Amino acid sequence: TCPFYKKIPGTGFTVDAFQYGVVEGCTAYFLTHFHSDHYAGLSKHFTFPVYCSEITGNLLKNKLHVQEQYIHPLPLDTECIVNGVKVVLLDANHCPGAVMILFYLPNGTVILHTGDFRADPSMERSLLADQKVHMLYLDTTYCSPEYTFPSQQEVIRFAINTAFEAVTLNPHALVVCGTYSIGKEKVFLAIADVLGSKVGMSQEKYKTLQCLNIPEINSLITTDMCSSLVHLLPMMQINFKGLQSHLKKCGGKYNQILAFRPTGWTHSNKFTRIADVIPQTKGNISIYGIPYSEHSSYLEMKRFVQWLKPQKIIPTVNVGTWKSRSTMEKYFREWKLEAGY
């Protein structure tokens, strides 16, 4: 049955609640982004109204074959009316098409659901600045002070310089990047751009990327692997065995692989700076784990909530254990006492 933290009080609305069958009293189903833990349950047989971004609507239509008449895409940063309630969709700084949703309840309560997000000071200048929020449904993925990670910009600088160096030293090296969902496209696109190559990938992945409105994408991606020296493979194939096999398939065009695994966090963060990151190497294969996150660090999360000053916080992640929930509630009290709301 549907958890309480997916239900918006005083409305007929749910958020990211497609795996519970017909939810009692739900008149409109919102989808924050196209990740499987959130969309699980949608298909061509869904016949309730789904409200989402344009990009998410493209992916529903083309990848899951949801019928167009049930997809209701909304423009960002625009006041819209849904079943009698004003809503706004804001950029979540997550994966392409990912949104936060502001709901303006008829009784005067204002609710922000972040979906999945990476908090940023840029958010302090959207339509959030203009009114008070009473309740915050918060992505608490990394809600503990051990979770520090560098900016996206520093991580991409490290990747570009590493790949450019390796291929300049050996023009017969192949670069491989792992993927399992949309998100983190900057990793493989920035590398291809510095090498003057397109990114080669499966037809299924190319189709997924064509749904995303990324400008000049026909310019950076391709299904012709033979013309490309940056290849995208499933994340599960980013290991020594999987990569030895791929290299066999390239028919002696290449004699070395440098591969990247963009992870969220890994405990090498508590000790090591990005500058200090080293690969695992075996033979002519090296694998770098890089801490490219599309969720808030602890400090970014803290800053956002201390700026927003909500009256109540409802966590949406790590809610399944009493020790996690207690930990989070303790941090929320600290933040409130330190900031004075």
The region of 20-28, 111-119, 135-143, 171-179 touching Ni ion under the rule CB under 5 A is: 111-119
* Shortest reach from residue 117's CB to Ni ion, in Å: 9
Among candidate residues 102, 83, 99, the one with its CA nearest the CA of residue 91: 99
Residue 36 or 69: the one with the smaller Cβ distance to Ni ion is 36
**In this complex, which beta carbon is closest to Ni ion, that of residue 35 or of residue 261?**
35
Q: Which is nearer to Ni ion, 31 or 155 (CB)?
A: 31
DSSP-derived secondary structure for 86-147 = EEEEEE-SSSTT-EEEEEE-TTS-EEEE--S----GGGGGSTTTTS--SEEEE--TT-STT-
- Residue 179 CB, shortest distance to Ni ion, in Å, is 14
Choice from 56, 111, 114, 116 touching Ni ion (CB under 5 A): 116
Nearest partner of 331 among 99, 117, 138, 116, judged by Cα: 138
Rounded to an integer, what distance in angstroms lies between the CA atom of residue 174 and that of residue 161? 15
Shortest Å distance, C-beta 113 to Ni ion? 13
Least distance between Ni ion and beta carbon 126 (Å): 20
Which of 13, 17, 23, 35 forms a contact with Ni ion (CB under 5 A)? 35
Per-residue x/- track, 70-109, Ni ion (CB under 5 A) = ----------------------------------------
Q: Which residue's CB is nearer to Ni ion, number 56 or number 269? A: 56
Tokens of 234: 């499933």
**What is the smallest separation between the CB atom of 162 and Ni ion, expressed in angstroms?**
26
**Residue (35 or 113) nearer to Ni ion, CB:** 35
Host H or E run for residue 61: helix 54-63
Q: Return the residues of window 168-227 that contact Ni ion according to CB under 5 A.
A: none
Q: Which residues of the shown chain bind Ni ion in the complex (CB under 5 A)?
A: 35, 116
